[PDB]
Ligand SMILES: O=C(O)[C@H]1C[C@@H]1C(=O)Nc1cc(F)ccc1F
């Protein structure tokens with residue numbers, strides 16, 4: 192095991208939880224992995240798959256993103272920063288995708304799931320792009336129960352890094368769609384204490400965070416340094432106590448360790 196792996200392991204030991212990291216450097220396509228093949232609860236990081244899948248639909252349904260979707264009072268779940276603003280109104284599939292990605296809105300995510308025919312339809316997209324590891328099983332908010340050993344709504348750091356790469360840097364999506372996804376991720380509001388906090392301040396990043404029970408604290412990011420090829424980094428973290436507090440600082444520190452290890 193490398194120096195970076197030794198430092199990640201020490202970080203993990205200090206934290207009291209379980210840490211999963213995957214970095215892909217698109218320069219030589221080398222990967223740095225820590226518990227890169229263990230399952231972790233995705234929590235809101237799964238929102239990237241649901242949004243990408245609706246993007247995929249729009250490559251044939253050209254005005255899909257502009258379609259109004261009713262927000263009903265019964266639609267609202269535990270955390271709806273944007274959707275609660277449009278109750279007895281409508282938001283578009285574009286606005287829903289933005290709200291899900293940028294504010295982590297759970298009602299928004301449930302609309303995206305419905306648009307895909309259920310959690311199976313989101314998993315269908317993963318399979319359509321070669322990700323055989325991602326599984327989405329539940330809707331919001333129960334997908335965040337993050338129960339130790341539960342395989343539902345999990346993926347591995349290696350799979351999610353490979354997927355995020357294909358979506359934002361690769362050609363799993365049409366160009367218009369990819370660029371929309373990159374824009375959306377770049378404008379995330381929830382990520383300042385996570386991966387971004389561990390990165391040289393002049394790097395551009397887009398990311399999606401996620402949190403859940405068992406103090407589960409996640410972030411997935413595409414990163415663009417300057418004068419070197421982009422990176423994708425996944426940092427997943429979960430803890431033994433059901434009511435454990437969030438540890439975004441762990442993700443910041445994993446990303447600092449990786450950033451130094453380049
Ligand atoms: O075992 C697995 O995870 C893969 C082979 C199973 C599979 O693709 N199932 C599956 C895929 C989907 F996209 C939706 C529902 C499903 F049950």
Ligand SMILES: O=C(O)[C@H]1C[C@H]1C(=O)Nc1cc(F)ccc1F
Nearest residue numbers: 311314315317318319321322323
């Ligand atoms: O979905 C795929 O193309 C890969 C996972 C393989 C598969 O057989 N899929 C699959 C299996 C199932 F049992 C149900 C739905 C599915 F899509």
Ligand SMILES: O=C(O)[C@H]1C[C@H]1C(=O)Nc1cc(F)ccc1F
Nearest residue numbers: 235270295335400401402403404
């Ligand atoms: O965590 C997020 O990204 C936002 C979506 C909100 C959410 O459901 N998270 C969440 C769920 C839980 F069940 C427990 C803790 C949480 F932080």
